Design an enzyme around this catalytic site. Sequence first.
Site, mmCIF file in Angstrom:
data_model
loop_
_atom_site.group_PDB
_atom_site.id
_atom_site.type_symbol
_atom_site.label_atom_id
_atom_site.label_comp_id
_atom_site.label_asym_id
_atom_site.label_seq_id
_atom_site.Cartn_x
_atom_site.Cartn_y
_atom_site.Cartn_z
ATOM 1 C CB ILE A 1 -0.983 0.166 1.191
ATOM 2 C CG1 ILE A 1 -1.876 -1.025 1.235
ATOM 3 C CG2 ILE A 1 -1.759 1.250 1.237
ATOM 4 C CD1 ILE A 1 -2.450 -1.654 2.270
ATOM 5 C CB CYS A 2 0.208 4.717 -2.078
ATOM 6 S SG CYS A 2 2.024 5.614 -2.410
ATOM 7 C CG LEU A 3 5.291 3.962 2.143
ATOM 8 C CD1 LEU A 3 7.186 4.216 2.024
ATOM 9 C CD2 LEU A 3 5.533 3.382 3.374
ATOM 10 C CG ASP A 4 1.606 9.125 -0.754
ATOM 11 O OD1 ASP A 4 3.300 8.775 -0.698
ATOM 12 O OD2 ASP A 4 2.072 9.776 -2.139
ATOM 13 C CB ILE A 5 -2.655 5.511 2.171
ATOM 14 C CG1 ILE A 5 -3.292 5.796 0.977
ATOM 15 C CG2 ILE A 5 -3.733 5.046 3.861
ATOM 16 C CD1 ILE A 5 -1.951 5.969 -0.284
#
Length: 183
Positions: free
Chosen positions: A117-121
């Site tokens: 899962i993208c770290l941005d979230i």
Amino acid sequence: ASTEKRLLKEYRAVKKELTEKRSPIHDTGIVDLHPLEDGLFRWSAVIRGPDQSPFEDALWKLEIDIPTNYPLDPPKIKFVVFGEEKIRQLQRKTSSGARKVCYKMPHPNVNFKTGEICLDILQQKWSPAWTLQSALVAIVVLLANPEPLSPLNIDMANLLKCDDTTAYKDLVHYYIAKYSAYE
């Protein structure tokens, strides 16, 4: 040292809410949570797809890695994704009354191969006031509210950007129907 105490407390907090017919947590989508092996810094979880989303009424497995400076930094979280071969081997051992989980996650913010899962979230949301429970809830939310700003799956993100809802839904339904197995 004391981070273990915090992690334990949070874990027990989730366990308490889980073993019970109506605590609010049951409608958040959290189904299960426990240490991956024998330590408090790696976790296995099980979540349900949120209502009125194409992911609804299906289960996914998650792996959670905890940083040393927790909770100064958020957990790293990924979906458990298997290869087609492995999945098909798992399906031949299954039961028609077992707990079935889908082992492919097609989603704009998820790496289809690794499950990352993208770290941005989490990086954009996380604060020391957050817990493991809130992170899980955040991912269940993410299943219903993708952000095409930070894509790891180009095709899904573009389907969403072109507002082609039917193709999106049909794809998710396809992977749910074809790539699920026991355990």
